[PDB]
From a paper:
Coliphage N4 is a representative species of the Schitoviridae family of bacteriophages. The most commonly isolated and well-studied group of phages is the order Caudoviricetes, or tailed phages. These phages have an icosahedron-based head containing the dsDNA genome, formed from copies of a major capsid protein (MCP) that adopts the HK97-like fold. Often, these capsids have exterior ‘decoration’ proteins that stabilise the capsid and/or perform other functions, such as host adhesion or bacterial hitchhiking. Structural analysis of the major capsid proteins (MCPs) and decoration proteins (gp56 and gp17) of phage N4 reveals a pattern of interactions across the capsid that are mediated by structurally homologous domains of gp17.
The N4 capsid was solved using cryo-EM to a final resolution of 2.45 Å. The map confirms the previous conclusions with respect to the gross structure of the N4 capsid, with a T = 9 geometry of MCPs (gp56), and three copies of the decoration protein gp17 per ASU. The three unique positions of gp17, hereafter referred to as gp17α, gp17β and gp17γ, were identified to bind around quasi-2-fold axes of symmetry. Gp17 forms three beta-strand-rich Ig-like domains, labelled DI-DIII, from the N-terminus to the C-terminus, separated by a flexible linker. Interestingly, coliphage N4 decorations bind horizontally to the MCP–MCP interfaces. A copy of the DI domain sits on each quasi-3-fold axis, with DII lying principally on the P-domain of a particular MCP. We propose that a consistent binding pattern benefits the capsid stability by ensuring a copy of gp17 DI is present to reinforce every quasi-3-fold axis of the capsid.
Residue numbers in the entry:
A (entry chain L): 2 to 279
B (entry chain C), E (entry chain H): 1 to 51
C (entry chain D): 52 to 401
D (entry chain C): 152 to 401
F (entry chain K): 1 to 279
G (entry chain I): 352 to 401
Write the structure that this text describes.
């Protein structure tokens, strides 16, 4: 930002103001300077800026310019009154890299001080693909994208990339930080078994004849690819009927008595015992 | 003013031009950080029968 | 050393069986290229471990290839200093002829206090193991009211010790097995925790899992074991050290209302919020201080004094009536093992 | 040097994990916490969650006594220090870090603290490596690398009161954690060419140079390092391997 | 195969992860190149009269 | 990393490395595919390492089938490799990493690229040192050298300072690129020390020059100093000539024979033009 | 130059060639230059007569 500097001859008070600020106490405008400095942001400050501006103005009359030794250079009697917006400072920067694995929740948090309140936060994501640019993370599905803390639930291999947060104050001054997310990926273990639940399946001819009941299948270990399920062996058609869609078996009773359904993914099998009551 | 600035943050020193940079922007601590071997509790419990 | 910038970097070598070990060297037991080269990684699941065992046949071949990885840590130093000014008349006409001795002593005391505070703040900010009391998940959710206030409990201390044991943070003390003096108690504490004066009453009112007093005062085991400087007692696995200048995040918690049962609060932007207080554990080899030109010390003060006279007579003060004294230094730390810095965040009673 | 050290560390860890998996799978005396009768019924919710209890440990001791598994430790009859306790534990149990808080919150038959911390009896008896305390009949040893069956329990829902779960086929299921007692003479390791040890690592390393110069690489620019071994166990008395399957708190 | 690759050209070695790179990607030749002072031909011709 | 196919004749023991769209009808069996400029280690491996890796996964009794050691194709001394794919594209002469110049000087960039499938096309781009600036194609119509291997930016001003990039493409569409930073050094303009008039003196004829007059041009010394706004400080004698100034050009028209002068100024410096009028 | 030579015999007997009938000889080296003062390298480019 550009800071305007006003100087009062009679009180030796130098007032720092926003570019649009002004005074009506007899102070005269002596110049403006960039804070933070564009080329040396962390090597100089407002004191150095004010000293440099004052060095080029007459001590006899600050309105006019002058050269040494007829300029204002004795800073010991100069009081700097700060009335401009405080500098925007990134208190807690993000971790340059975060490493995790699939299925883990990841949280980013940033703390920012200074600036003109209220502050606004906007997160962005850039994929690792070639030519991918930063894109805003929609705050609709993920409300946390509007706040200083961003939470991404159950990250995946597609979540890997660079995450950036842009913080803007009331005056439009922006400060941002970025982090690279690395998601460890491993081969899914081969299916060692299929689990059916519930098993046994209890049916009533009186209650379940229309809609039947469902059995769900899962793979062991957890996170293994169950594959496409099919019925290898139908139940006794005099006792029950069975249909499979995705990972759900629907079984309908026909008459009282026990039967079984064998479900397979082509490599593993699971038997569902079906107990039919009247 | 000749300023060191902050070369590690992309802020070059005044002495370095477009085709120059600091040769040594950090000091390398050559002693690395390592983790110890995990403990074993069941291996000592095993008796040995020669095959 | 000089002429190497302001930063120190160090390598950390990851173990083979670790989830951080991401590499493309993996070839499974059938000879096929696979996405991970760390075998089963940090997994403890029996099923997952079985599927990724490095099984070998009598034919050998290019099967079960693995890779490794390393990490780089870094830290940097920063510049600090302050000063004060005086005139000749403030010395010559003042009643106390020892004024300057007082002022210099106070300047040095302030400098030491500031360095201690900065180190503590950095250690608190660098903690890798952070635990939130109650049901809170961040500073902004730390609340002293509601159905579950964020007050440190016995279970929180238990979980902090559990986490420090899983990540293999070395212990700091040994258990006390008792004495023959009547009314003494045996202490199972093995770690050192730092708290402020404001939390101690809450800890002294703490109950264990069965409603009994969890806090043990030092007199109950001072006979059989050495008492550490600043120690107030022990709870479960921790020996509590009261730090006179422990820091806290004022008004960093959730908004406080009339339901406040008596926990501390601060005004933030004209609104009342709960204060967040730390309980800190500093594990061994967790961090180091970067000493630039400090002669082996973590820090070095440079003091520059000029008294009124010809030493300050100048174009700006032709009379030499003013003097000054300043102090400056450098400081930084390098966090080697952030997980060995554990922290509990909680509200404190009034 | 770093790479070789890491390779050896991985090898030892893998061998330990394989032996532990074999011992867990070979258990003959298996006890299910709560009302569970199989892995799929291990559940952390409901009216009778599958959480290990004091009566479960009592019954495991009963079963080990019925089949006459020899005891491993002798009782501690006390010391003269104040605040010390006597210990009647005679068997050794191995548990993971996940279960220790659950064992510390356990109540005895009268509703009091069943878990005894080592400092209460360290003066009178020797504390074992990794011991965290004792419950009536078992001295508890915490194993850093204790394995478990991720997502091998029942399906978890929003009613989960705070027990660990794993994602299986897109659905959350409760983890199953082992509490293992390794009785004497229960098993033995088959040592093939191990010179009396249960295991032997054979490490072959070839560095770049004339050692690896070959028709396939005349310049010898590449090297390698390999490690191999044989391992096996013989389970003699499967009933002396006692196991309790239970959920663990978060 | 663990390869050195081309770290100076942005191709990380097999051992360096996302958090790491080579600490020493080049050797610094500390003897710098400098230019000699320009010659003077008219200054030697100048006699001096005191002021 | 164009993907290359590999095919293997089991009788001749000949591995033909072809392009992905390529084919062979000689009894060769496809044994797999591999990116030649490898996608992770582009300069640590070659075609040989790719054919050796694809043939290790195939049977030494029937290359069409897969096999494991010790029944795989693993002696490469007996195996030949016949390359029939486009050669890899190679920047033989890269651009300098930084070129430093001064304003008004011509700069020239030049790339040499070997390999690929002829013809090789060229496209020069430029990014400004400005904020959030992106590479943009240099007008190949205005500058005709931006469609060739050698770009020439004549009389580079400060606005020229920025990153130049060339993109060379083969007939297959494979690309390769090189970039150079231009630094355009700038010095404050010298102050005007004088104004020069040419021609001076100005010769006029009443007979020939009465309608159109003649012109005098002004320049500053030293060369490259800002002459500023010129004005007539002193008009000629109106009985001898008239004078008007526009920009840096004075037009003088004769009225009658005889000598006169025009004084031109930029507000700080003056120049007198002598005007000689003949009949 | 690094010269590696393996003559036929036991030194080259292997499952690929059980009889060890072949050998080889290879030579390899590293090279590079650093240009300090490029302006001191002067070059004239011209055509040449047949």
């Amino acid at each position: 930002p550009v800071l305007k500097v006003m100087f009062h001859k009679d009180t030796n008070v130098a007032t720092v103001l926003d570019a649009s600020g002004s005074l009506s106490d007899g102070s005269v405008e002596v110049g403006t300077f960039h804070h933070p400095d564009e080329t040396y942001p962390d090597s100089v400050t407002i004191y150095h800026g004010v000293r440099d501006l004052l060095y080029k103005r007459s001590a006899k009359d600050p309105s006019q310019t002058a050269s040494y030794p007829n300029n204002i250079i004795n800073m010991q009697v100069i009081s700097i009154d700060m009335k401009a917006t405080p500098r925007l400072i990134l208190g807690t920067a993000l971790p340059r890299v975060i490493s995790t694995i699939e299925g883990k929740d990841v949280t980013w948090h940033v703390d920012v001080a200074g600036g003109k309140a209220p502050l606004t936060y906007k997160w962005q994501f850039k994929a690792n693909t070639v030519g991918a640019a930063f894109a805003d993370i929609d705050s609709g599905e993920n409300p946390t994208a509007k706040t200083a803390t961003l939470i991404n639930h159950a990250v995946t291999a597609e979540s890997a990339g660079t995450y950036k947060v842009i913080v803007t104050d009331a005056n439009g001054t922006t400060i941002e930080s970025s982090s690279l997310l690395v998601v460890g990926v491993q081969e899914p273990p081969e299916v060692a078994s299929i689990v059916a639940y519930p098993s046994p399946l209890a049916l009533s001819v009186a209650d379940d004849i229309t809609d039947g009941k469902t059995v769900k299948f899962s793979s062991l270990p957890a996170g293994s690819l169950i594959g496409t399920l099919s019925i290898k062996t139908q139940p006794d058609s005099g006792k029950a009927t069975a249909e499979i869609s995705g990972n759900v078996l629907t079984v309908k009773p026909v008459a009282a008595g026990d039967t079984t359904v064998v479900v397979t993914n082509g490599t593993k099998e699971v038997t569902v015992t079906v107990n039919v009551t009247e | 003013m000749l300023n060191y600035n902050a070369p590690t943050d992309g802020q070059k020193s005044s002495i370095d031009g477009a085709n120059s940079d600091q040769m040594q922007t950090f000091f390398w601590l050559k002693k690395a950080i390592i983790t110890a071997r995990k403990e074993q509790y069941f291996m000592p419990l095993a008796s040995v029968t020669n095959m | 050393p000089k002429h190497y910038g302001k930063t120190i970097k160090v390598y950390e070598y990851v173990p083979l069986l670790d989830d951080r070990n991401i590499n493309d060297q993996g070839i499974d037991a059938s000879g096929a290229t696979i996405v991970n080269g760390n075998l089963y990684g940090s997994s403890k699941d029996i099923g997952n471990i079985t599927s990724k065992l490095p099984l070998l046949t009598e034919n050998g071949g290019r099967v079960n290839r693995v890779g490794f990885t390393r990490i780089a840590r870094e830290g940097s130093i920063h510049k600090f200093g302050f000063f004060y000014e005086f005139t000749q008349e403030s010395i010559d006409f003042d009643s106390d002829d020892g004024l300057m001795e007082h002022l210099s002593r106070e300047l040095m005391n302030g400098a030491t206090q500031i360095t201690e505070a900065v180190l503590q703040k950095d250690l608190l900010a660098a903690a890798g193991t952070v635990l939130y009391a109650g049901a809170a998940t961040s500073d902004a959710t730390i609340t002293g009211e509601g159905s579950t206030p964020s007050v440190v409990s016995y279970k929180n201390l238990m979980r902090l010790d559990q986490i420090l044991t899983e990540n293999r943070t070395p212990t700091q003390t040994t258990i006390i097995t008792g004495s023959r003096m009547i009314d003494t108690k045996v202490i199972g504490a093995t770690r050192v925790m730092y708290v402020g004066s404001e939390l101690v009453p809450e800890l002294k009112a703490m109950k264990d899992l069965f409603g009994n007093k969890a806090f043990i005062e030092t007199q109950h085991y001072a006979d059989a074991g050495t008492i550490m400087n600043g120690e107030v007692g022990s709870i479960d696995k921790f020996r509590i050290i009261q730090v006179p200048e422990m820091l806290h995040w004022a008004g960093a918690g959730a908004q406080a209302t009339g339901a406040n049962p008596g926990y501390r609060t601060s005004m933030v932007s004209g609104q009342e919020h709960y204060d967040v207080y730390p309980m800190l554990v500093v594990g061994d080899d967790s961090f180091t201080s970067i000493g630039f030109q400090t002669d082996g010390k973590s820090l070095k003060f440079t003091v520059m004094t000029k008294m009124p006279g010809k030493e300050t007579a100048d174009r700006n003060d032709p009379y030499g009536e003013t003097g000054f004294s300043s102090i400056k230094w450098y400081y930084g730390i390098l966090v080697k093992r952030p997980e060995r810095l554990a922290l509990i965040k909680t509200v404190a009673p009034l």
